[PDB]
């Protein structure tokens, strides 16, 4: 996250971290056993850390659990980036509590201007790289499609929304992919991509989760 601000302790309980040697992506716990995240974060061996705040220090409130199932959406296109969404099955259900809760799936799609909260431990600098210990938070509104498409002509699908500022400054970045974009106590977006970070006229592109409630809900029920 760039331009955001350090989240308070356990402010966002449902946020996780895809670790495989080291933090490389994030995710969000939806139910005690499953984790939704960006499909381009797929990796053969994943360790889902939870209850994390400062990912460099064992504060003794975290739960390290390996993924057992890692199912990327069927129609995901590595090329076109469409359908960037995957579900990860914790090989042992987490212990839902204060420092480890679950975000609610979207009942409907987020309207333009709906304010949201983005978090991650991704890069903090526009130019250069500064990786934080602590989780970062960002407040950004979900931009209109009419506007989104303009900034990335020909690249916006029916499944991607834009969320940020056409003016730059506050955006997501390397290391935030897979993470949540939570709007009104509902998961309305998953970090996926952008050109640079917080660059002008290039908001961040996020997978539109609302187009996945039925898939998610079926997959979990099926697996």
């Amino acid at each position: 996250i760039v331009g955001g601000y350090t989240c308070a302790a356990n402010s966002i309980p449902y946020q996780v971290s895809l670790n495989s040697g080291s933090h490389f992506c994030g995710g969000s716990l939806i139910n005690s056993q499953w984790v939704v995240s960006a499909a381009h974060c797929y990796k053969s061996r994943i360790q889902v850390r939870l209850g994390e705040h400062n990912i460099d220090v064992l504060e003794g409130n975290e739960q390290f659990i390996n993924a057992a199932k890692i199912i990327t959406h069927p129609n995901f296109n590595g090329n076109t980036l469409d359908n960037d969404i995957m579900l990860i099955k914790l090989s042992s259900p987490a212990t839902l509590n204060s420092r480890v809760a679950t975000v609610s799936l979207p009942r409907s799609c987020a309207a333009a201007g709906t304010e949201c909260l983005i978090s991650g431990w991704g890069n903090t600098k526009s130019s250069g790289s500064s990786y934080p210990s602590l989780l970062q938070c960002l407040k950004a509104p979900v931009l209109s499609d009419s506007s989104c498409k303009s900034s990335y002509p020909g690249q916006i699908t029916g499944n991607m929304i834009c969320v940020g500022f056409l003016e730059g400054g506050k955006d997501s970045c390397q290391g935030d992919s897979g993470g949540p974009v939570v709007c009104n106590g509902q998961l309305q977006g998953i970090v996926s991509w952008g050109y640079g970070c917080a660059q002008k006229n290039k908001p961040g592109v996020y997978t539109k989760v609302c187009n996945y409630v039925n898939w998610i809900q079926q997959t979990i029920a099926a697996n």
Binding site: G21, H23, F24, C25, A38, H40, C41, K43, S44, G78, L81, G122, N123, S129, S172, C173, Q174, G175, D176, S177, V191, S192, W193, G194, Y195, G204
Partner: protein
């Protein structure tokens, strides 16, 4: 899998790495003037076993933290000293379609700028961390070397006949 730098560590998405070659005979990648260019605009390969060339800032639009092979990449030379006639030229690696030696890799502003992304791919017979860059306009084509005849410069180009096996080394 993630692309490893020569020190067995993965490449940070958006970091700065030297793009050395496997064969110690040559050196690193760098821009150099070629043919009829008053500015060093041709992404070349040194021939000196000691010049690690210029630093490149590999990166993907994909917000993951490290560089995984098969992911669209954007390569860009870090700022390097040029003459007054060149201070300000853009540093991003590009591919100008249609040129004698084939689609050349050039930096700076070039009219016939072909749209596509670079991508790294491992090659090495499971020893060192040997990769190769390919260009896939928006199937793909490798990036080999086309020697300047009337000069000798090892110009970077997309050649099916032969790719360019390279290995990165973090800057810092």
């Amino acid at each position: 899998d993630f692309v490893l730098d020569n020190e067995g560590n993965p490449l940070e998405n958006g970091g700065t790495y030297y793009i050395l070659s496997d064969i110690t005979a040559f050196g690193g990648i760098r821009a150099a003037p070629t043919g009829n260019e008053r500015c060093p605009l041709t992404v070349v390969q040194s021939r000196n076993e000691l010049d690690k060339g210029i630093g490149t800032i590999i990166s993907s639009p994909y917000r993951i933290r490290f560089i995984a092979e098969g992911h669209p990449l954007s390569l860009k030379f870090d700022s390097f000293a040029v003459i007054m006639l060149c201070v300000g030229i853009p540093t991003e690696w590009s591919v100008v379609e249609d040129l004698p030696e084939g689609p050349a890799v050039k930096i700076g502003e070039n009219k016939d700028a072909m749209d596509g992304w670079f991508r790294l791919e491992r090659v090495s017979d499971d020893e060192f961390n040997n990769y190769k860059l390919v260009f896939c306009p928006q199937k793909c084509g490798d990036i080999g070397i086309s020697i300047d005849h009337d000069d000798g410069t090892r110009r970077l180009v997309v050649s099916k006949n032969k790719p360019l096996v390279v290995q990165f080394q973090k800057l810092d």
